[PDB]
Design a protein around this ligand. Structure first.
Ligand SMILES: CCCCCCCCCCO[C@@H]1O[C@H](CO)[C@@H](O[C@H]2O[C@H](CO)[C@@H](O)[C@H](O)[C@H]2O)[C@H](O)[C@H]1O
Ligand SMILES: CCCCCCCCCCO[C@@H]1O[C@H](CO)[C@@H](O[C@H]2O[C@H](CO)[C@@H](O)[C@H](O)[C@H]2O)[C@H](O)[C@H]1O
Ligand SMILES: CCCCCCCCCCO[C@@H]1O[C@H](CO)[C@@H](O[C@H]2O[C@H](CO)[C@@H](O)[C@H](O)[C@H]2O)[C@H](O)[C@H]1O
Ligand SMILES: COc1ccc(NNc2ccc(CO[C@H](C(=O)O)[C@H](N)C(=O)O)cc2)cc1
Ligand SMILES: COc1ccc(NNc2ccc(CO[C@H](C(=O)O)[C@H](N)C(=O)O)cc2)cc1
Ligand SMILES: COc1ccc(NNc2ccc(CO[C@H](C(=O)O)[C@H](N)C(=O)O)cc2)cc1
Ligand code: NA
Ligand code: NA
Ligand code: NA
Ligand code: NA
Ligand code: NA
Ligand code: NA
Ligand code: NA
Ligand code: NA
Ligand code: NA
Lengths: 423, 423, 424
C-alpha cells in the first residue's frame, strides 16, 4: 500500500532510519534482536539483487558486444583499464595521506619485534589470467564466475554480429533469433531490477540497521580514528578524484552523483559490489544514457578489478598496523605500498577471498607479517573488528568509481546520451 | 513390436505382474537376483523422467506465468496453499484414526523409561523461506532446486508480458522470441514424456518387483498391521477427503481418478513425487484440461510442500512408536502432532532428506526422542524395515493430492476445460 | 602481420620448431624455463578450445538430430558403433604385433613371482550405461559430461522435428524458434573455432615444446624402444586400417589425410580428444562435407568411447610389462588382452580417469596386478615416465579414427558432400 510514495526518497529515509535505529538498538544491547528480526529483510533484498547478477551480465553483454565493433570494444577496454589503474593508485595515495593526517594507530602502543613470516600467496598472475578464459561456460555461469562470463559473452556477441553480416539467409536469421533471445532476456532483467527497487528501502533500512547495531559500539578509541580517516578519505576520493576527472571530461559532477545515488546506497548497504551490479547497470542505462556497448562491458569488469575504496582502506590499515606496533613507514615503503596495492588488484582478479589476500599482500610488501600471536596479527584483528562499518563506505566508493569511469569513457566515445544531462 | 497394445492396460499389466513376480522371487530367496538383473530397467524409467523434471518445470512456468495476471496468480497461490495445509492436517488426522483402529505397535512391548536427552533444532523456518529466492538461477537449475526455479520462472514470465505490452516494436519482438523459445522447450518436454510412457510398463514392472522382492518377506506381524493401517488410511484420504472435496466443488470424483491413474501409478512405483512431475503435468493438461497457468505453478509447488501420504504415514508411525514402548499418546499430544506435522511440512520446504527430518520433528514434539539405543530408536528402526512398501502408497497419495488441488482451484477460476469431462 | 600468412604452413612450422626447441632446451636442462615461460601460451590454446566443447556439442546435436530421420539416426549409430569396435580390436592387435617386433621391455630383467593380490575391480557396466541418461541435463552440461548431453540433445532434436511437422502454426513456430536459437549458437561456435585456430601455431609450438622439454631425456634405452614401437603401430593403424577401410568404401585416403591435418595436429599436441572436438567437427563440416546429422553425433561419441590409439598403447604396454617381469604372454592370453581391451572401452564409457582404469583392467585380465612395490607396479611406472610422448601420438590416432569412421558412415548414407572431394 506504500508503493505510491516515491522510491528514491524512500531509500534515503530507510538509510537514515536504519542507521539511527541500529545505533539506538545496539547501544542498549538489543543488537541480537536486530540480527534475528530485522536482518532477514535486508537479506531478502540482497538475495533478490544477487539473483539477477548472472543473467543480466550475460545477456546485456552478448547484446552490447554484438551492437558495437570489435575495434571500438578494444578501445573501450584500453581506456577503462587505464582509468581503473590510475584511480586505484590515486586511492592508495589518498589512504596514505588521510592516515598520516589522522595519525592512525599512534596510541595503541604495542611492543613489537622484527620477525617476518609469509601467510597467503598471490595466485600466480599467469594462472589468474589463464583463468579468465573459462573451460566450461555453463560451469562458470553456475559457479557465478564473472570474468569468464564476460569473456564468453564478448566472444559470442562478436560472433553474432559477424554472422548477421553474412550472405546466407538461414545464417542471418538464426544469429538474429539468438540475439533476440539475449535482448529479450536482458530487457526482462532490467524490468525486474526496477521491480526489486520497490522493496529496496526496506532492505536498506534492515542492512544499515544491523551493521550499525552490531558494530556501532566498537567505533571508539583508535578504531574510531580509523573510521574517521577511512570515511574522510572515501569522501575525498569522490569530491576530488571523481569530480575533477568528471569536470575535465565535461560532465557536471553534481548531476553525476544525483543520478548515481541508487547504485551508491545499494553498494553502501549490501557491501557487495557484484550484487549491486543490476542497480548499477540499470542506473548507467536509464539515468546517464550510456550505450549498452560501453557499460555492459565496463561495469562488470569494474566490479571485479576496480575497488578504489578497498585501495584507500588498505592505505589506511597499513599505516594503522605500522604505527600501532611502532614502525612508521618510510617514503619508499609507501611507494611500495601503492605499487603493490595496484599490482594486487590485478593479481587477485576474480579470486575468492581476494580482500584478505590483497591486504596480506600489501602488509607483506612492507614487512608486516600476520604470524599468529604476534602484535601485527593483533592490530589487524583490531581493524577486522570494525570491518563492516568500513565495508559499507568501501563498497560504496568501489561502485561509484565504476560509474564515473563508465560515464567518462562513454563521453569520450560519443556514446553518452546528452538529453539526460539538461536542466 | 509391443508398442501397438494400449498403454494404460500395459501399465496395469506391469504393476500386477511385477508385484506377483517380486513376492514369488523373495519367497524363494532370489531377491538379490531381482536387485541385480530386474531393477536396472526401473532405474532407467526413473532416470528418463527425472531428466525431464528441470526443463519442463522451468519452461512450463515461464509460459504459464506469462499467460495469467499476477493478481490471478496470487489468488491461485493463496487458494492452493490453503488447500494444501487443510488437506495435510486432514491426512495426519486420518493416520491417527486408522492407527488407533489397527492398534498399531500394541504387541511390541518394549520397556521405556522417563529419560529425556535434549537434541538439536529443526532446520530454520526463515532460512528455508529465504532459500526460495535463488542467488544464482543457473545454479539452482544445475542443483535441481525446484522452489527457487519456481520463483525465478514466475518473475521471468511476468517480466515477459509487461515487455510484450510496450510501445517499441524491437522490445516486443525480443520478448516474443524469448517466450517462443520457452514454449518450444515445453512442447518438446511433453512430447518426450509421452514417448517415455511407452517404456513405462517395463519399468513399472521392474520397480514393483524389486520392492516386493526386498520387502515382501517383512510384511508380517506388527509391521504387517502397520502396512494395513497405512494403506487403509491413504485409501480413506482419497475416498473421503478428496472425493468429498471434489463433490463439494463440482468435479466428478470417478472421472478424476480415471484421468489421474497414470500419474498415480507412476508415483506409486517411482516413490519420488518430484520425478513423477512430467507425467503429472501431462495428465493435468492432456487429460484434465487444466489451464497451464494453474498447474504449471501448483504442481511443482505441490510436489515440494504437499504430502498428504507422508502426513498420514507420520500419524500412523507416531502412534506405532508410542504404543510399542508402552506410552499411548494423550489427546492433546495428538493435536500437538497435527499442528507440528503441518508446520514441519512448511519448515522443511525444499530441504534435502526432509522426510526423516519431519519425522524427527513430529516425534520430538510429543517427547519421543530418538536417542540411539533407546526403545524409541528401536521402534523407529522397526518401521524403516518396511519403508519402501510404505513409500509406494504415500508417494501415490502425495501426487494425487496435488492433482485434486489443481483441478479444484482451476474449477474455481473457470480455468478448467469442461469438455474433457463429458462423455 | 600474422593472419595473412597461410594457416597450414604456420601450424606445421610451430609443431616442428616447438619440438626442436623443446628437445634442445630440455636436452640442455632448461625445461623449467619452458614450463614457466613457454608452457602458459599452450595452456591458453588448450583452454580456448576446451571452452567451446560443451556449447558446440549441445547445439550441433540438437540441430543435427532435428535435420535427420530417427530411423536414419539409428542406422548411423549402429554403423558407427560396429566401425568403432572393429577398429579398436584391430588397434589392440596391431599394438601386440609391433610390441612383439620391437621386443619391448626385453632387457629390463626384473624377477617376478606368480602371486597376485587383487587390488583393482571394474566399475559396474550397468551403472555406467544408466549414467548415459542424465537426471538433470543442466547438471550434465555444467559438469561437462558428454555422453548424457548427447542423449539429451538427440531426444530434444527429435522432439523438435516431430513438433515442426504438426498441424498447428503456433507449435511449429515455437519449435522452429527453439531450433534457430540452437542453430545460431552452433554457427557462432564454429565461427569462434576458426578464430581460435589463428592463435594455433603459437599454442602448438608451446605445448610440443613443453612436452619435448620435460620428456626428451627419457627416450633412451628400453623406453626408447617403447616409443619406437608405439609410434610405428600408430602409423600402421593409419596407413593400413584407415587407408584400406577408406579405399574399400571409395574414399581417397590421401585426400582424407590432407583434410584431417588440423584435427590431427590439434589432437596430437593437446592430448585431449574431447578438447580437440571443436576443431574436429569444424573439419568434418567445413573440410570433408559431412552432414551435421552424421558428424554431430558420431564425433563426440567417438571422442568419448573410441580410442584406437589408446588401445594400441595398451597392446604395447601389456607386452612390455609381461616381458619386463619375465612372464611372456600366451597366444590365448593375448586374445584375452584384445577381448578385454575392447570390452574396457565400453565399460568405462564417460567415466573419469578411464585411461589407467582400462590399463589396470587389461593387466589384471592376464594376471598382472599392480600391488604397490611389486615388480609389475615397477614396470608400469617405467612406462608412465614417458606417458606424454605417448599421449600425443595416441590422442592423435584416437581422433583420426573418429574422422575416418564418420566419413565412411557418411559415404554409406549419401550424406557426404562429394563436391568437397574434387581437385582442380
Ligand atoms: C512491500 C514491497 C513489495 C514490492 C514488490 C513489488 C514490485 C512492484 C514493481 C513496481 O515498481 C515498478 O516496477 C517497474 C518494473 O516492473 C519499473 O519500470 C521501469 O523498468 C523499465 C525497464 O524496462 C524502464 O524502461 C521503465 O522506464 C521503468 O518504469 C518501475 O521503475 C517501478 O516503479
Ligand atoms: C532408452 C530407449 C527407450 C526406448 C522407449 C521407446 C520410445 C517410445 C517410441 C515412441 O512412441 C510414441 O511416442 C509418441 C510421442 O509423441 C507418443 O505420442 C504421445 O504424445 C502426443 C501428445 O501431443 C500424442 O501423439 C499422443 O497424445 C501421445 O500418445 C506415443 O504414445 C507413442 O506411440
Ligand atoms: C585471446 C584472444 C584470441 C582472439 C582470436 C584471434 C582472432 C583472429 C582474428 C579474426 O580472424 C578471422 O576470424 C573469423 C572468426 O571470427 C574466421 O572466420 C571463419 O569462420 C567461418 C565459419 O562460419 C567460415 O565460414 C569462414 O570462411 C572463416 O573465415 C576467420 O577464419 C579468421 O581468419
Ligand atoms: C562467506 O565466505 C566468504 C567467501 C568469499 C568472500 N569474498 N570474496 C571477496 C572478493 C573481493 C572483495 C572486495 O571487497 C570489498 C571490500 O571489502 O572492500 C567489498 N566487499 C566489495 O564488494 O567491493 C571481497 C570479498 C567473502 C566471504
Ligand atoms: C537421494 O535421494 C533423495 C534426494 C533428495 C531428497 N530430499 N527431498 C525429499 C523431501 C521430502 C520427501 C518425502 O518423501 C516422500 C515420502 O517418503 O513420503 C516421498 N518420497 C515423495 O516423494 O512423496 C522425500 C525427499 C531425499 C532423497
Ligand atoms: C579437465 O581436467 C581433466 C579431466 C579428466 C581427466 N581424466 N580423464 C580421462 C583422461 C583420458 C582418457 C583417454 O585418454 C587418452 C589416452 O591417453 O590414450 C587421451 N588422453 C585422449 O585424449 O584421447 C579418458 C578419461 C584429466 C583431467
Ligand atoms: Na580504480
Ligand atoms: Na563483491
Ligand atoms: Na568495483
Ligand atoms: Na495436504
Ligand atoms: Na522426491
Ligand atoms: Na505432492
Ligand atoms: Na576404434
Ligand atoms: Na579427453
Ligand atoms: Na576417439
Amino acid at each position: 500500500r506504500y508503493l505510491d510514495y516515491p522510491v528514491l526518497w524512500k531509500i534515503l529515509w530507510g538509510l537514515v532510519l536504519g542507521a539511527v535505529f541500529g545505533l539506538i538498538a545496539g547501544h542498549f544491547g538489543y543488537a541480537g534482536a536486530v540480527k534475528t528480526y530485522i536482518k532477514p529483510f535486508g537479506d531478502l533484498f540482497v538475495r533478490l539483487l544477487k539473483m539477477l547478477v548472472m543473467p543480466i551480465v550475460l545477456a546485456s553483454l552478448v547484446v552490447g558486444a554484438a551492437s558495437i565493433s570489435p575495434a571500438r570494444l578494444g578501445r573501450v577496454g584500453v581506456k577503462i583499464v587505464v582509468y581503473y589503474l590510475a584511480t586505484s593508485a590515486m586511492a592508495v595515495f589518498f589512504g596514505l595521506i588521510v592516515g598520516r593526517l589522522f595519525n592512525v594507530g599512534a596510541n595503541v602502543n604495542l611492543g613489537s619485534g622484527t620477525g617476518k613470516a609469509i601467510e597467503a600467496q598471490p595466485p600466480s598472475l599467469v594462472q589468474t589470467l589463464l583463468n579468465i578464459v573459462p573451460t566450461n561456460p555453463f560451469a562458470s555461469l553456475a559457479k557465478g564466475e564473472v570474468l569468464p562470463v564476460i569473456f564468453f559473452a564478448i566472444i559470442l556477441g562478436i560472433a553474432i554480429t559477424y554472422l548477421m553480416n553474412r550472405n546466407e539467409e538461414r545464417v542471418r536469421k538464426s544469429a538474429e533469433t539468438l540475439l533476440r533471445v539475449f535482448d529479450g532476456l536482458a530487457e526482462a532483467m532490467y524490468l525486474i531490477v526496477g521491480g526489486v527497487m520497490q522493496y529496496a528501502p526496506i532492505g536498506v533500512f534492515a542492512l544499515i540497521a544491523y551493521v550499525m547495531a552490531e558494530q556501532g559500539v566498537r567505533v571508539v578509541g583508535p578504531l574510531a580514528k580509523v573510521v574517521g580517516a577511512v570515511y574522510t578519505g572515501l569522501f575525498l576520493q569522490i569530491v576530488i578524484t571523481y569530480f575533477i576527472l568528471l569536470k575535465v571530461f565535461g560532465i557536471d559532477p553534481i548531476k553525476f552523483i544525483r543520478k548515481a545515488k541508487d547504485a551508491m546506497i545499494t553498494a553502501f548497504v549490501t557491501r557487495s559490489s557484484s550484487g549491486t551490479l543490476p542497480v548499477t547497470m540499470r542506473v548507467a542505462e536509464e539515468e546517464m544514457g550510456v550505450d549498452k556497448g560501453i557499460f555492459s562491458f565496463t561495469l562488470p569488469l569494474g566490479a571485479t578489478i576496480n575497488m578504489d575504496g578497498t585501495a584507500l582502506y588498505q592505505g589506511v590499515t597499513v599505516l594503522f598496523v605500522a604505527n600501532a606496533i611502532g614502525h612508521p613507514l618510510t617514503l619508499g615503503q609507501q611507494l611500495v605500498v601503492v605499487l603493490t596495492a595496484v599490482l594486487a588488484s590485478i593479481g587477485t582478479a576474480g579470486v575468492p577471498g581476494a580482500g584478505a589476500i590483497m591486504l596480506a599482500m600489501v602488509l607483506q610488501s612492507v614487512g608486516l607479517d600476520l604470524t599468529p600471536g604476534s602484535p601485527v596479527a593483533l592490530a589487524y584483528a583490531m581493524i577486522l573488528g570494525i570491518d563492516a562499518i568500513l565495508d559499507m563506505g568501501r563498497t560504496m566508493v568501489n561502485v561509484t568509481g565504476d560509474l564515473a569511469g563508465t560515464v567518462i569513457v562513454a563521453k569520450t566515445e560519443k556514446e553518452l546520451d546528452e538529453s539526460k544531462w539538461i536542466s
